[PDB]
Amino acid sequence: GSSDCRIIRVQMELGEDGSVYKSILVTSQDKAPSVISRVLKKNNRDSAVASEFELVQLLPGDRELTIPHSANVFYAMDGASHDFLLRQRR
Structure with a gap:
């Protein structure tokens, strides 16, 4: 429509809960x-906790x-859909 939106999807596989x-x-x-x-602190009880990742x-x-x-x-990464995967170094 008059305004446009793009969606993003990332996946971090690490954390005390990861x-x-x-x-x-x-x-x-x-x-x-x-x-x-x-989202880390808010989701550090079920998902990941440390966003120190790549x-x-x-x-x-x-x-x-x-x-x-x-x-x-994203103005530069969100041209198409945005999919990412995160690896916590620490």
Whole structure:
């Protein structure tokens, strides 16, 4: 319609409880790859707890969405759908 939105999906497989998925609604200009950090403490009882990880975007493996990137990341990472998998280094 007049406004457009893109969706993102990440999967962190580590933590005291560890997790394996992560799906959140993204708007055309919303940088929510960082919502996982707020999700960590909120989901640190069932899913993952430590977001100190390396994130890789795209099923084929091409773009990486780790924390070294800046806030305006999806404006550049969310062109298509956003799929990532997170590996906690610590």
